[PDB]
Short mmCIF file of C-alpha atoms in Angstrom, two decimals:
data_model
loop_
_atom_site.label_atom_id
_atom_site.label_comp_id
_atom_site.label_asym_id
_atom_site.label_seq_id
_atom_site.Cartn_x
_atom_site.Cartn_y
_atom_site.Cartn_z
CA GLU A 46 -17.80 -50.02 -156.86
CA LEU A 47 -15.83 -52.58 -155.61
CA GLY A 48 -16.89 -54.72 -152.28
CA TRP A 49 -14.21 -55.57 -149.78
CA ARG A 50 -15.53 -54.87 -146.24
CA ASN A 51 -17.28 -58.16 -146.03
CA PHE A 52 -14.14 -60.10 -146.59
CA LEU A 53 -11.42 -57.83 -145.01
CA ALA A 54 -13.08 -58.24 -141.29
CA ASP A 55 -10.16 -56.57 -139.49
CA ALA A 56 -10.60 -52.92 -138.50
CA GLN A 57 -7.05 -52.00 -138.79
CA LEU A 58 -6.61 -53.98 -142.17
CA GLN A 59 -9.88 -52.20 -143.20
CA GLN A 60 -8.32 -48.67 -142.40
CA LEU A 61 -5.21 -49.73 -144.61
CA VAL A 62 -7.32 -50.37 -147.71
CA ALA A 63 -9.23 -47.31 -147.34
CA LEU A 64 -6.29 -45.09 -147.41
CA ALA A 65 -4.89 -46.91 -150.39
CA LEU A 66 -8.03 -46.35 -152.27
CA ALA A 67 -8.46 -43.01 -151.11
CA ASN A 68 -4.85 -41.98 -152.35
CA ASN A 69 -5.12 -39.23 -154.91
CA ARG A 70 -2.38 -41.11 -157.39
CA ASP A 71 -3.67 -42.01 -160.96
CA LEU A 72 -4.05 -45.80 -161.92
CA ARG A 73 -0.82 -45.72 -163.81
CA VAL A 74 1.03 -44.73 -160.48
CA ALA A 75 -0.82 -47.00 -158.61
CA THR A 76 0.27 -49.70 -160.91
CA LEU A 77 3.83 -48.77 -160.19
CA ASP A 78 3.21 -48.68 -156.54
CA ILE A 79 1.89 -52.15 -156.56
CA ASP A 80 5.01 -53.18 -158.58
CA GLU A 81 7.43 -51.65 -156.33
CA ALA A 82 5.69 -52.93 -153.20
CA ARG A 83 5.80 -56.68 -154.46
CA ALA A 84 9.35 -56.37 -155.60
CA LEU A 85 10.28 -55.33 -152.00
CA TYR A 86 8.41 -58.01 -149.94
CA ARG A 87 6.92 -60.96 -152.14
CA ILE A 88 8.67 -61.42 -155.57
CA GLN A 89 12.17 -62.62 -154.16
CA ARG A 90 10.66 -64.38 -151.04
CA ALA A 91 9.07 -66.99 -153.69
CA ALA A 92 11.98 -68.98 -152.69
CA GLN A 93 10.34 -70.78 -150.07
CA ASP A 125 8.22 -65.57 -160.49
CA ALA A 126 7.14 -61.94 -160.80
CA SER A 127 3.54 -62.87 -161.17
CA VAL A 128 3.16 -64.83 -157.78
CA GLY A 129 -0.44 -64.72 -156.71
CA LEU A 130 -1.80 -62.75 -159.37
CA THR A 131 -4.78 -64.11 -161.07
CA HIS A 132 -5.12 -64.27 -165.17
CA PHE A 133 -6.72 -60.70 -165.69
CA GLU A 134 -4.18 -59.34 -163.33
CA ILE A 135 -1.29 -60.72 -165.37
CA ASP A 136 -3.11 -59.46 -168.31
CA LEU A 137 -3.34 -56.12 -167.32
CA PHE A 138 0.11 -55.47 -165.96
CA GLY A 139 1.67 -57.11 -169.32
CA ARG A 140 -0.55 -54.90 -171.45
CA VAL A 141 0.47 -51.44 -169.73
CA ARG A 142 4.07 -52.28 -169.73
CA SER A 143 4.02 -52.83 -173.48
CA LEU A 144 2.47 -49.25 -173.80
CA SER A 145 3.52 -45.37 -173.56
CA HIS A 146 2.55 -43.30 -170.82
CA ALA A 147 -0.46 -41.75 -172.89
CA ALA A 148 -1.77 -45.21 -173.95
CA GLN A 149 -1.37 -46.59 -170.53
CA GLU A 150 -3.56 -43.65 -168.72
CA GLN A 151 -6.22 -44.32 -171.56
CA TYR A 152 -6.30 -48.16 -171.42
CA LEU A 153 -6.59 -47.77 -167.54
CA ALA A 154 -9.44 -45.43 -167.80
CA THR A 155 -11.88 -48.39 -168.83
CA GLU A 156 -14.19 -49.65 -166.43
CA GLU A 157 -12.55 -53.19 -166.24
CA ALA A 158 -9.02 -51.89 -166.31
CA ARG A 159 -10.13 -49.56 -163.29
CA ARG A 160 -11.71 -52.67 -161.35
CA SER A 161 -8.60 -54.91 -162.11
CA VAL A 162 -6.17 -52.20 -160.49
CA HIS A 163 -8.48 -51.91 -157.35
CA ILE A 164 -8.65 -55.47 -156.96
CA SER A 165 -4.95 -55.69 -157.11
CA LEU A 166 -4.68 -52.83 -154.66
CA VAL A 167 -6.78 -54.18 -152.18
CA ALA A 168 -5.50 -57.56 -152.12
CA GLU A 169 -1.95 -56.42 -152.23
CA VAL A 170 -2.68 -54.12 -149.28
CA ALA A 171 -4.18 -57.34 -147.40
CA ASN A 172 -1.51 -59.80 -148.14
CA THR A 173 1.25 -57.52 -147.10
CA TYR A 174 -0.50 -56.54 -143.54
CA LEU A 175 -1.01 -60.23 -142.97
CA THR A 176 2.72 -61.11 -144.10
CA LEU A 177 3.70 -58.34 -141.56
CA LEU A 178 1.80 -59.84 -138.95
CA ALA A 179 3.03 -63.71 -139.69
CA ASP A 180 6.73 -61.94 -139.95
CA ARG A 181 6.11 -60.51 -136.38
CA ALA A 182 5.12 -63.93 -134.95
CA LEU A 183 8.23 -65.57 -136.58
CA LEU A 184 10.26 -62.89 -135.00
CA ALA A 185 8.83 -63.64 -131.57
CA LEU A 186 9.10 -67.23 -132.18
CA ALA A 187 12.75 -66.73 -132.93
CA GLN A 188 13.33 -64.35 -129.80
CA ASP A 189 11.83 -66.76 -127.44
CA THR A 190 13.89 -69.58 -128.98
CA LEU A 191 17.12 -67.30 -128.57
CA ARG A 192 16.43 -66.59 -124.83
CA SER A 193 15.67 -70.43 -124.02
CA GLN A 194 18.67 -71.74 -125.88
CA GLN A 195 21.04 -68.91 -124.04
CA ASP A 196 19.87 -70.38 -120.76
CA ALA A 197 20.35 -73.68 -122.01
CA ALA A 198 23.90 -72.90 -123.03
CA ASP A 199 24.84 -71.27 -119.69
CA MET A 200 23.28 -74.30 -117.89
CA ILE A 201 25.80 -76.70 -120.15
CA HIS A 202 28.79 -74.75 -119.43
CA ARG A 203 28.19 -74.66 -115.89
CA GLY A 204 28.18 -78.33 -115.24
CA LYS A 205 32.05 -78.77 -116.43
CA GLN A 206 33.31 -82.23 -117.55
CA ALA A 207 35.79 -83.88 -119.70
CA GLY A 208 36.26 -82.31 -123.03
CA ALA A 209 35.62 -85.38 -125.25
CA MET A 210 31.96 -84.98 -125.09
CA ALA A 211 31.36 -81.98 -123.10
CA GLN A 212 33.07 -79.79 -125.67
CA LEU A 213 30.91 -81.39 -128.27
CA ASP A 214 27.73 -80.34 -126.17
CA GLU A 215 29.21 -76.94 -125.81
CA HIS A 216 29.58 -76.38 -129.61
CA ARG A 217 26.03 -77.95 -130.07
CA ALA A 218 24.54 -75.47 -127.55
CA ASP A 219 26.20 -72.66 -129.12
CA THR A 220 25.07 -73.30 -132.79
CA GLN A 221 21.43 -73.51 -131.41
CA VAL A 222 21.93 -70.18 -130.15
CA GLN A 223 23.52 -69.25 -133.38
CA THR A 224 20.69 -70.52 -135.54
CA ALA A 225 17.91 -68.52 -133.20
CA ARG A 226 20.02 -65.43 -133.71
CA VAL A 227 20.40 -65.78 -137.38
CA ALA A 228 16.37 -66.50 -137.74
CA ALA A 229 15.66 -63.27 -135.64
CA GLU A 230 17.75 -61.13 -137.85
CA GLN A 231 16.04 -62.83 -140.86
CA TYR A 232 12.61 -61.98 -139.56
CA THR A 233 13.60 -58.47 -138.43
CA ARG A 234 14.63 -57.72 -142.01
CA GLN A 235 11.45 -59.29 -143.43
CA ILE A 236 9.52 -56.94 -140.96
CA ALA A 237 11.20 -53.91 -142.36
CA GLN A 238 10.18 -55.05 -146.11
CA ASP A 239 6.66 -55.78 -145.07
CA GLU A 240 6.43 -52.12 -143.53
CA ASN A 241 8.08 -50.44 -146.47
CA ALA A 242 5.89 -52.10 -149.17
CA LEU A 243 2.74 -51.38 -146.81
CA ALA A 244 3.79 -47.74 -146.83
CA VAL A 245 4.24 -47.72 -150.63
CA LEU A 246 0.98 -49.44 -151.24
CA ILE A 247 -1.23 -47.06 -149.24
CA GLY A 248 0.80 -44.08 -150.48
CA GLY A 249 1.89 -42.60 -147.27
CA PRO A 250 3.06 -43.06 -143.59
CA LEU A 251 1.69 -46.09 -141.67
CA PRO A 252 -0.97 -45.22 -139.01
CA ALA A 253 0.09 -45.69 -135.19
CA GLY A 254 -2.74 -48.51 -135.15
CA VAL A 255 -0.05 -50.65 -137.21
CA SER A 256 2.54 -50.31 -134.48
CA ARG A 257 0.25 -51.74 -131.88
CA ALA A 258 -1.52 -54.61 -133.28
CA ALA A 259 -2.53 -57.76 -131.85
CA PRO A 260 -0.18 -60.91 -132.66
CA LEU A 261 -1.34 -62.89 -135.57
CA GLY A 262 -1.99 -66.08 -133.27
CA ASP A 263 -5.56 -67.37 -133.78
CA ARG A 264 -7.56 -64.18 -134.18
CA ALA A 265 -9.72 -63.92 -137.40
CA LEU A 266 -8.86 -60.82 -139.93
CA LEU A 267 -10.50 -62.54 -142.75
CA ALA A 268 -14.17 -63.42 -143.02
CA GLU A 269 -14.88 -67.04 -144.38
CA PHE A 270 -16.33 -67.57 -147.83
CA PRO A 271 -19.97 -68.07 -147.65
CA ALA A 272 -21.46 -71.29 -148.82
CA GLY A 273 -23.07 -71.52 -152.30
CA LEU A 274 -21.29 -68.52 -153.86
CA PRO A 275 -23.06 -68.26 -157.46
CA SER A 276 -20.79 -68.58 -160.39
CA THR A 277 -22.78 -65.42 -161.83
CA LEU A 278 -19.93 -63.45 -159.49
CA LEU A 279 -17.24 -64.09 -162.20
CA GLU A 280 -19.23 -61.73 -164.43
CA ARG A 281 -17.36 -59.13 -162.65
CA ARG A 282 -14.02 -60.59 -163.48
CA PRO A 283 -12.18 -57.75 -165.38
CA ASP A 284 -11.16 -60.49 -168.14
CA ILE A 285 -14.91 -61.48 -168.70
CA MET A 286 -16.16 -58.02 -168.53
CA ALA A 287 -13.71 -57.35 -171.60
CA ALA A 288 -14.67 -60.29 -173.44
CA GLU A 289 -18.23 -59.51 -173.29
CA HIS A 290 -17.56 -55.75 -174.03
CA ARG A 291 -15.59 -57.15 -177.28
CA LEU A 292 -18.67 -59.40 -178.18
CA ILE A 293 -21.14 -56.63 -177.52
CA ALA A 294 -19.13 -54.30 -180.19
CA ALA A 295 -18.77 -57.13 -182.31
CA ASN A 296 -22.91 -57.40 -182.40
CA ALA A 297 -23.06 -60.60 -180.47
CA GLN A 298 -25.92 -61.10 -178.07
CA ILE A 299 -24.20 -61.58 -174.72
CA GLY A 300 -27.20 -63.41 -173.24
CA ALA A 301 -26.79 -66.27 -176.09
CA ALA A 302 -23.26 -66.26 -175.36
CA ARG A 303 -23.70 -67.18 -171.68
CA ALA A 304 -26.43 -69.73 -172.39
CA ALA A 305 -23.70 -71.31 -174.64
CA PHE A 306 -20.49 -70.75 -172.71
CA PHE A 307 -21.04 -69.77 -169.16
CA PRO A 308 -22.00 -72.70 -166.43
CA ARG A 309 -24.57 -71.64 -163.85
CA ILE A 310 -23.40 -73.58 -160.57
CA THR A 311 -22.56 -72.88 -157.09
CA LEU A 312 -18.86 -72.23 -156.68
CA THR A 313 -18.52 -73.01 -152.73
CA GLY A 314 -19.81 -75.70 -150.22
CA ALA A 315 -19.52 -75.49 -146.52
CA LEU A 316 -17.02 -73.54 -144.88
CA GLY A 317 -16.07 -72.05 -148.17
CA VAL A 318 -14.38 -75.58 -149.86
CA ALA A 319 -15.03 -76.24 -153.33
CA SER A 320 -18.61 -77.20 -154.06
CA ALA A 321 -19.63 -80.54 -155.56
CA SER A 322 -20.73 -78.89 -158.86
CA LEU A 323 -17.47 -77.03 -159.19
CA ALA A 324 -15.29 -80.18 -158.42
CA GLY A 325 -17.48 -82.09 -160.91
CA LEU A 326 -16.56 -79.80 -163.56
CA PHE A 327 -13.07 -80.88 -163.40
CA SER A 328 -13.54 -84.56 -162.45
CA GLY A 329 -11.24 -86.53 -164.33
CA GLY A 330 -8.90 -83.63 -165.07
CA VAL A 331 -7.62 -82.56 -168.47
CA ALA A 332 -10.44 -80.29 -170.36
CA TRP A 333 -13.57 -79.64 -168.15
CA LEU A 334 -16.97 -81.26 -168.26
CA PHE A 335 -18.87 -78.43 -168.99
CA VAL A 336 -21.32 -78.91 -172.40
CA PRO A 337 -21.73 -75.95 -174.37
CA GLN A 338 -24.85 -75.97 -176.51
CA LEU A 339 -26.34 -73.33 -178.94
CA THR A 340 -29.97 -72.33 -178.43
CA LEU A 341 -29.94 -68.92 -178.76
CA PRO A 342 -28.03 -67.24 -181.88
CA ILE A 343 -25.16 -65.35 -180.89
CA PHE A 344 -24.82 -63.30 -183.81
CA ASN A 345 -27.87 -61.36 -185.55
CA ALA A 346 -26.00 -62.12 -189.05
CA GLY A 347 -25.46 -65.11 -191.01
CA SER A 348 -27.46 -67.79 -191.71
CA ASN A 349 -29.63 -69.76 -188.91
CA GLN A 350 -27.85 -72.92 -189.51
CA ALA A 351 -24.32 -71.26 -188.89
CA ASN A 352 -25.73 -69.62 -185.64
CA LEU A 353 -26.59 -73.17 -184.29
CA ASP A 354 -23.25 -75.01 -185.14
CA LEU A 355 -20.64 -74.54 -182.36
CA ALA A 356 -17.47 -75.41 -184.78
CA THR A 357 -18.39 -72.48 -186.92
CA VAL A 358 -19.42 -69.97 -184.15
CA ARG A 359 -15.85 -70.87 -182.64
CA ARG A 360 -14.15 -69.53 -185.89
CA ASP A 361 -15.08 -66.13 -184.66
CA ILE A 362 -12.23 -64.73 -182.58
CA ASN A 363 -14.32 -63.12 -179.74
CA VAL A 364 -16.33 -66.18 -179.36
CA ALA A 365 -13.42 -68.51 -178.96
CA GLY A 366 -11.84 -66.01 -176.76
CA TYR A 367 -14.84 -65.66 -174.65
CA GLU A 368 -15.35 -69.34 -174.16
CA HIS A 369 -11.56 -69.81 -173.16
CA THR A 370 -11.56 -67.03 -170.87
CA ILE A 371 -14.51 -68.60 -169.11
CA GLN A 372 -12.86 -71.97 -168.89
CA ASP A 373 -9.65 -70.46 -167.45
CA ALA A 374 -11.48 -68.33 -165.09
CA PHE A 375 -13.43 -71.27 -163.54
CA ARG A 376 -10.12 -73.61 -163.51
CA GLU A 377 -8.36 -70.77 -161.76
CA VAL A 378 -11.42 -70.55 -159.20
CA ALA A 379 -11.00 -74.35 -158.47
CA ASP A 380 -7.20 -74.21 -158.34
CA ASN A 381 -7.20 -71.75 -155.41
CA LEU A 382 -9.88 -73.51 -153.64
CA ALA A 383 -7.62 -76.89 -153.72
CA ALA A 384 -4.57 -74.84 -152.69
CA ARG A 385 -6.25 -73.58 -149.80
CA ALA A 386 -7.47 -76.78 -148.95
CA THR A 387 -3.90 -78.16 -149.13
CA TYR A 388 -2.44 -75.54 -147.04
CA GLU A 389 -5.01 -76.36 -144.27
CA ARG A 390 -4.01 -79.81 -144.52
CA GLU A 391 -0.34 -78.77 -143.99
CA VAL A 392 -1.23 -76.51 -140.96
CA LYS A 393 -3.14 -79.41 -139.20
CA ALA A 394 -0.08 -82.05 -139.95
CA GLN A 395 2.22 -79.37 -138.99
CA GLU A 396 0.55 -78.96 -135.58
CA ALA A 397 0.46 -82.53 -134.57
CA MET A 398 4.13 -82.78 -135.69
CA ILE A 399 4.66 -79.69 -133.32
CA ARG A 400 2.77 -81.91 -130.69
CA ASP A 401 5.17 -84.98 -130.83
CA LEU A 402 8.32 -82.90 -130.95
CA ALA A 403 7.35 -81.04 -127.97
CA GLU A 404 6.76 -84.33 -126.09
CA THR A 405 9.81 -85.70 -127.65
CA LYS A 406 12.03 -82.83 -126.30
CA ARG A 407 10.39 -83.31 -122.81
CA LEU A 408 11.26 -86.68 -122.39
CA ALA A 409 14.64 -86.01 -123.67
CA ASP A 410 15.06 -83.08 -121.16
CA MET A 411 14.17 -85.31 -118.54
CA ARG A 412 16.36 -88.20 -119.49
CA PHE A 413 19.30 -85.73 -119.73
CA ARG A 414 18.58 -84.07 -116.39
CA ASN A 415 18.94 -87.76 -114.67
CA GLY A 416 21.97 -88.33 -116.82
CA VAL A 417 20.33 -91.46 -118.64
CA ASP A 418 21.14 -90.16 -121.90
CA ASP A 419 23.28 -87.58 -123.58
CA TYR A 420 22.53 -83.86 -124.57
CA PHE A 421 22.46 -84.80 -128.29
CA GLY A 422 18.71 -85.87 -127.71
CA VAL A 423 17.62 -82.42 -126.64
CA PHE A 424 19.82 -80.81 -129.20
CA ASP A 425 18.14 -82.83 -132.01
CA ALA A 426 14.59 -82.68 -130.63
CA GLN A 427 14.84 -78.97 -130.14
CA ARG A 428 16.33 -78.28 -133.68
CA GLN A 429 13.47 -80.22 -135.09
CA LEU A 430 10.69 -78.59 -132.77
CA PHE A 431 12.07 -74.92 -133.99
CA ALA A 432 12.16 -75.58 -137.56
CA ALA A 433 8.50 -76.91 -137.44
CA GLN A 434 7.19 -73.90 -135.17
CA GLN A 435 8.48 -71.65 -138.06
CA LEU A 436 6.85 -73.65 -140.74
CA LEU A 437 3.54 -73.73 -138.94
CA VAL A 438 3.41 -69.82 -139.38
CA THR A 439 4.31 -69.77 -143.11
CA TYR A 440 1.75 -72.51 -143.71
CA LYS A 441 -0.97 -70.35 -142.04
CA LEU A 442 0.06 -67.33 -144.00
CA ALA A 443 -0.10 -69.31 -147.18
CA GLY A 444 -3.68 -70.12 -146.22
CA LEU A 445 -4.36 -66.49 -145.70
CA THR A 446 -2.79 -65.58 -148.85
CA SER A 447 -4.69 -68.14 -151.11
CA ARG A 448 -8.13 -66.80 -149.67
CA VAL A 449 -6.89 -63.27 -150.63
CA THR A 450 -6.11 -64.85 -154.25
CA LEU A 451 -9.56 -66.24 -154.34
CA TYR A 452 -11.32 -62.92 -153.46
CA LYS A 453 -9.74 -61.85 -156.71
CA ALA A 454 -10.27 -64.75 -158.97
CA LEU A 455 -14.23 -64.55 -158.07
CA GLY A 456 -14.08 -61.02 -159.43
CA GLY A 457 -14.05 -59.15 -155.96
CA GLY A 458 -15.37 -61.28 -153.42
CA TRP A 459 -19.19 -61.55 -153.02
CA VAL A 460 -22.03 -59.49 -152.57
CA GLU A 461 -23.77 -59.03 -148.98
#
């Protein structure tokens, strides 16, 4: 069926996905559960769009069944491509929800550590009484440091609740006790890295390419001829799962890609041989033109998610060096305040920037993980062992 154990490496994460797949609900209900779960924890957190994190074929599926009656939905969803599309969405949505859960716990723990340190900072400032011209200013500042920490902790406790609700919906039942006692996000690896040199033929398993090839078979076209004409044969990834030079070369210069379609095999058994070797005439067939566009969108989608990930990993490293400088700045501020050389504003300003940067680091790490989950989908379901 669908392969995901090579991508989802964490044992607890593997357990959740297996329970979501083993649920006895029908695919129409599974579609309704994924919709409800995303609304609980994902759609409205796009502020920091109902289709966020969905590939082209997922958007196709969810829009098609929404336009249909229940009878039509159950029949549309019985096809092999529709079944694979719902499985891919379900596997990915369980992973992104459990990863988001572990991220929101780290955010809560960070907000609680900040809350405890700032409560002791506010205690130390009030102890050293002084003239109210500036001392009263330091007291209000120290209190609004604690206030921002308390508010952040409350936001993350609520987001943890939403993650656990959506996770229960996605697996169709109560959460196992292993979720309650899972190791913090930190630096441990839950996803496996994409292998180097993934073949583009993996995209044949995309539900939107399967349906496009099915339409051509029913229209009496030869799929082999169509692949030769419109389906690039390149590697998709390079070292450490970055975009391969072949894939980046297809989109060098932007605009429309640089793949050159050529007709060497007749796509249709009918019509004159001259018509079978002219691209313009073959593109007037709706199933050939749709097939050609579906392949360009599939490759473009794969390149876009690889670049998106590279951007997020860049932001993580930038945020870490920023946290490195702010940590030292706050240390040199704490030192000058303890001696009395400078006022407390320097500690206040540095701590407030440090805590904001530490929260951003977690969100940027999660976005990198999320984009790997999305790339697992855009490939048609990861890679073969």
